[PDB]
Design a protein around this ligand. Structure first.
Ligand SMILES: *[B]([O])([O])[C]([C][C]1[C][C][C]1)[N]C(=O)[C]1[C]2[C]([C]N1C(=O)[C]([N]C(=O)[N][C]([C]N([C])S([C])(=O)=O)C([C])([C])[C])C([C])([C])[C])C2([C])[C]
Ligand SMILES: [Zn+2]
Lengths: 22, 181
């Protein structure tokens, strides 16, 4: 049987941030 | 501080299937909750105190893919519907709730946090019913308290007519008991 794979993440430790322009 | 969350997809269908058979995942890890998948389904896994916990009904008895190959489960409790593997190098752990609050917030696989009021020790009522399709793929996710501490792991919805009015969760106390077994 196959292994459970990590396909993505959810981060709770993030805080309001000004999105930077590139 | 307000509980906010965001999601990020790390791999696709073909990459996921290959990594499943291989059992070797070299991707970098970040976050407290991992979006996890099998060939059958996709659900969530929450890292709490150095251990990555998920739902037994989703992971079964499988290993988790890692840089070093498959990693065997540390804890397995069919009766409590739990499994645990050591938290992946890179993940960040949540910590058990101490304050004993009754105002919980469920974090879904789409990174939405919804308020739920604790009723029983394993039940809580959504303050805003949503179709079950909204909650789909969220079992194994966290039920946080206003302080951001793990109160339980989402496992099933109490729904009717296709609308979830309440949720069934696994309180963190069963994790202690599971580890102690
Ligand atoms: B997880 O992503 O795997 C998933 C998430 C879920 C919320 C919308 C999909 N969990 C499940 O699929 C669980 C798992 C399976 C059944 N299940 C459910 O959530 C189901 N709900 C229940 O079985 N609820 C019952 C009570 N009912 C019979 S009722 C009136 O249908 O709610 C309990 C609360 C007693 C558990 C469905 C019907 C899929 C919503 C298991 C192992 C419980
Ligand atoms: Zn708390």
């Amino acid at each position: 049987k196959g292994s459970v794979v990590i396909v993505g993440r959810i981060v709770l430790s993030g805080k309001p941030a000004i999105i930077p322009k590139k | 501080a307000p509980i906010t969350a965001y999601a990020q997809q790390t791999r696709g269908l073909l990459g996921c299937i290959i990594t499943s058979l291989t059992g070797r995942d070299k991707n970098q890890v970040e976050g407290e909750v991992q979006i996890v998948s099998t060939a059958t389904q996709t659900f969530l896994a929450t890292c709490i105190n150095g251990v990555c916990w998920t739902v037994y009904h989703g992971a079964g008895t499988r290993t988790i893919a890692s840089p070093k190959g498959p990693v065997i489960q540390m804890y397995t409790n069919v009766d409590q519907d739990l499994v645990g593997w050591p938290a992946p190098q890179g993940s960040r752990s949540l910590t058990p709730c101490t304050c004993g609050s009754s105002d919980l917030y469920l974090v879904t696989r789409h990174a939405d946090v919804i308020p739920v009021r604790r009723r029983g020790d394993s039940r809580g009522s959504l303050l805003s019913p949503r179709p079950i399709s909204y909650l789909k793929g969220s079992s194994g996710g966290p039920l946080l308290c206003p302080a951001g501490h793990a109160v339980g792991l989402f496992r099933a919805a109490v729904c009717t007519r296709g609308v979830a009015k309440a949720v069934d969760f696994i309180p963190v106390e069963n994790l202690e008991t599971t580890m102690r077994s």
